[PDB]
């Protein structure tokens, strides 16, 4: 029954999910050993310097959390700080050279699971996709 | 050129947040008033269908002997199972309306999939599990 595919196919999301912080497919090709999460805070420190604060929002995670990643980041010799404009309190994060290609690799990295999202949902008819978009807007609805 | 591929990638990020940080994707909250965490009841609801050696539950589960030994521990010192001679684990009846409860709630799951799927025709059905399928063949 249809029931039974969701619930397998949400049961086969988790097992590919553990231990990650998030879905890419494909293999990270980046050549600096970083967590999924790492290389996504300097893709979003790539996209646009930022805060403690900023990233914790965007990653959805506790401060404290991002301040243990970036303490490691900045030791790793990815990123450095530097004061706000106006307010000298603020502190703003941003990559050095090293981390350029990293971040580039990750966004890419992001691409391409967006490119095969894409290829897959194009192997179906205008109307198919409009029937698979309605269901996916339907099951989102149950887990909020 | 549209919304469909950012619409993927968005709902597998909501069953992400949703299932963080928890073993397996239930609907609703656990009701039984023995608080356990969701490995250890799915392992009373195992017990039920069929006693059960470690081993076997380790490849149910895809966990590892050593957390199956874990969890059977917390289990047995609660008094919920019973060990035989392998070694053959068992409920007891205390933990019977435990493992009734967490079957139930993966009934109330599904079936909540069932009313979401039935808004669909026959055809249109038939659609989605092709999806599905085609989309499970990329996590595998
Ligand atoms: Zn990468
Ligand atoms: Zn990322
Ligand atoms: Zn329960
Ligand atoms: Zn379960």
Redesign the pocket.
């Known amino acids: 029954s249809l029931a039974n595919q969701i619930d397998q196919f949400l049961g086969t999301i988790m097992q590919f999910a553990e231990n990650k912080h998030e879905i ?1 497919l494909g293999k ?3 050549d600096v050993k ?1 967590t ?1 999460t790492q ?1 996504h805070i300097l893709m979003l420190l790539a996209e646009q310097i930022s805060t403690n604060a900023k990233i914790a929002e965007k990653l959805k995670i506790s401060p404290a959390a991002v301040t243990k990643a970036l303490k490691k980041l900045q030791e790793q010799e990815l990123i450095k700080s530097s004061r706000a404009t106006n307010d000298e309190r603020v502190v703003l994060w941003s990559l050095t050279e090293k981390a350029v290609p ?1 971040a580039k ?2 966004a890419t ?1 992001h691409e391409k699971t967006l490119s095969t999202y894409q290829e897959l949902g194009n192997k179906f008819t205008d109307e198919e996709q409009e029937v698979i978009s309605k269901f996916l807007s339907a099951l989102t609805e149950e887990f909020q």
């Open positions: 890419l990270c090709e980046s970083l999924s290389e990293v690799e990750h990295h």
